Amino acid sequence: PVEADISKLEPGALLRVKWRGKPVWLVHRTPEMLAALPSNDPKLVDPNSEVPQQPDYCKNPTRSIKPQYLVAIGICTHLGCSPTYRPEFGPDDLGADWKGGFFCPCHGSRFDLAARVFKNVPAPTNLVIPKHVYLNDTTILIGEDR
Amino acid sequence: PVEADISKLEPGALLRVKWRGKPVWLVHRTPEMLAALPSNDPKLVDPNSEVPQQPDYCKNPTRSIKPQYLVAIGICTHLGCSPTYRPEFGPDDLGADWKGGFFCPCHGSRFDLAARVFKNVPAPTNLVIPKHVYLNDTTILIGEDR
Ligand SMILES: [Cl-]
Ligand SMILES: [Cl-]
Ligand SMILES: [Cl-]
Ligand SMILES: [Cl-]
Ligand SMILES: [Zn+2]
Ligand SMILES: [Zn+2]
């Protein structure tokens, strides 16, 4: 397991830590990012996280332990590329209704800020969320829990 | 880093976990083992751990964070063999004054239960103690500290 220190992760920033050779992202989400998430539901493949791509304590609307932070494995569920981080709302290339999220440059898969995949893109499932636990308010242990 | 679960490690038992290809031992020491450690001092090369073979939080009489557990890299400082574990007091082959420890089968180096090397053996230094931290009472993370 690896410890991620988020004490300096500002609103909207993304921290990358390597675990089992995979990039694990930790994103500090703002209330605005959180407010927009449920509006994505109708356009998402698996809005309720029914597919077991996360620990049960992350099977919820924000797919996380705390709403302020998203912890997920930054590997596209299509062919394994690393998606780009696109937190800004409504960029021209992604559409005016874009509420922030991730965009994979290899085949265009889109995921929102709970790392949930949108309908009709190559990736068929939500990004994987690793087992993890907070050791304290600014430190997350990745790779294990309990 | 590697996680060591010592929740089932009984008094006097030794747990081995692999870290960076090296064997890391975690020994549950009894009050009797601990009581005998200072008696080895006069016979040890580096009783005070002056040679930097451990993190500062392990530069002490028991070369550990807590007295109940010894955490050390199980590789002899002479030529790299893995020493045998000999916790029993006074076996005939090691002498009646033996207070438990480790014995390397390749050239006879002896180390006590704080993994400190005895004088006049091939190994010249105390066994290396890796960086580590307790995540909780029965879980030690090896390879990282705070
Ligand atoms: Cl891909
Ligand atoms: Cl894709
Ligand atoms: Cl040796
Ligand atoms: Cl030896
Ligand atoms: Zn992709
Ligand atoms: Zn040896």
Tell me, what CATH number does A43's domain have? Answer: 2.102.10.10
Q: Examine residue B113 and state whether it is found in any structural domain, yes or no.
A: yes
**B28 in a labelled binding site:** no
Number of domain units in chain B: 1
Q: Examine residue B106 and state whether it is found in any structural domain, yes or no.
A: yes
What pairs with residue B86 in β-bridges? B101
The kind and range of the H/E element at A32 are helix A31-36
E strand map for B64-138: 69-73, 84-86, 101-103, 110-111, 132-136
What pairs with residue A103 in β-bridges? A84, A110
Q: Examine residue B116 and state whether it is found in any structural domain, yes or no.
A: yes
Q: Do A141 and B141 touch (CB under 8 A)?
A: yes
Domain interval for residue A40: 2-142
User: What Å resolution does this PDB entry report?
Assistant: 1.7
Give the determination technique. Answer: X-ray
* Residues of A whose CB is below 8 A from B3: 1, 143-144
What pairs with residue A42 in β-bridges? none
Ligand 3 geometric centre to CA of B104 (Å): 7
* Residues of A whose CB is below 8 A from B141: 1, 3, 141
Q: Strands A22-28 and A69-73: what pairing? A: antiparallel
Q: Examine residue B126 and state whether it is found in any structural domain, yes or no.
A: yes
Determine the Cα angle at A126 with ends A123 and A127, to 5°.
Answer: 90
Tally of CA atoms within 13 A in the half-sphere of A109 that contains its CB: 23
d(CA B108, CA A111): 60
d(CA B10, CA A74): 40
The alpha-carbon gap from B59 to the nearest alpha carbon of chain A, in Å, equals 24
Q: Out of B18, B20, B107, B119, which one is annotated catalytic?
A: B107
Contact in structure between B2 and B136 (CB atoms under 8 Å): no
d(CA B146, CA B133): 7
Chain-centroid distance, C-alpha A57: 15
Q: Examine residue B60 and state whether it is found in any structural domain, yes or no.
A: yes
**B81 in a labelled binding site:** yes
- Which amino acid is it at B50? E
**Tokens, residue A140:** 């997350």
Q: Do A2 and B135 touch (CB under 8 A)?
A: no
Contact in structure between B76 and B124 (CB atoms under 8 Å): no
